[PDB]
Ligand binder design. Structure first.
Ligand code: ACO
Length: 213
């Protein structure tokens, strides 16, 4: 298992990895936006920009060369959220608004930039480990490695939208604090029908945070 940067060359490698793996993400699942093998071009654009910040780590299989997992890291800045919410209005895909409305509202509703007095935040945004290679403590390694990329680039706060409770555990293990905790059940539409019908054990979404060097 080898942990290194992601060259410009391996970007559609990564996308074809995400297509085939990342769709069974808890939140995604409960609204159903993206699906195995088929492109989800909407998100794939965000991910392409996050990748171009060039802080993003990958795990390659020593012996086969196959893409095992990735941590996509991006620089968040003041007003980024507010821009995303304004841009989200013009976009007219209801599923997308349910996912990212929750994410951006929750984030916006705790000014972390003000809380910790910082102008940029290191964001572990997307954490993918292939179906095949999943459960061998690879995420935990990607996470730890992501934390150290932050300290090398002189960031002060690392933050993660921990929708998966496995991702919460990893964060717990590196000593991350829960900033906001929100239950997926709490959100019901005009009828009273649950909007995030999440399958256990992912009963809540945590924004989680660690202060670094
Ligand atoms: C819609 C959006 O874009 S929101 C984006 C936000 N989402 C995320 O960042 C998370 C999404 N990522 C995923 O869904 C991935 O498929 C992952 C996280 C499941 C893959 O991670 P893995 O390689 O399985 O993690 P790893 O194998 O290192 O396990 C680490 C921790 O998870 C726990 N864990 C992992 N898999 C399981 C499981 N199946 N059951 C119970 N616990 C598990 C381990 O016990 C460990 O916790 P510990 O520190 O208490 O031991």
């Amino acid at each position: 298992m080898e942990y290194g940067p992601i060259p410009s060359s391996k970007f559609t490698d990564v996308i074809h990895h995400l297509r085939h793996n990342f769709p069974d993400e808890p939140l995604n699942a409960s609204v159903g936006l993206c699906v195995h093998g088929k492109p989800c071009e909407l998100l794939e654009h965000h991910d392409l920009q996050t990748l171009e910040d060039g802080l993003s780590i990958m795990a390659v299989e020593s012996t086969t060369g196959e893409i095992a997992g990735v941590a996509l890291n991006g620089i968040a800045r003041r007003g980024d959220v507010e821009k995303a919410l304004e841009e989200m209005k013009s976009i007219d895909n209801i599923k997308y608004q349910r996912i990212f409305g929750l994410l951006n509202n929750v984030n916006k509703s705790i000014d972390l930039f003000t809380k910790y007095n910082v102008d940029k935040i290191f964001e572990l945004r997307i954490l993918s480990v292939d179906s095949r290679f999943r459960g061998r403590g690879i995420a935990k390694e990607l996470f730890l490695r992501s934390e150290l990329i932050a300290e090398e680039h002189g960031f002060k706060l690392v933050k993660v939208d921990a929708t998966s409770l496995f991702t919460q555990r990893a964060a717990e293990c590196l000593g991350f604090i829960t900033e906001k905790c929100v239950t997926y059940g709490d959100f019901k539409d005009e009828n009273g029908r649950k909007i995030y019908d999440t399958k256990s054990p992912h009963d809540y979404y945590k924004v989680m945070t660690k202060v670094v060097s």
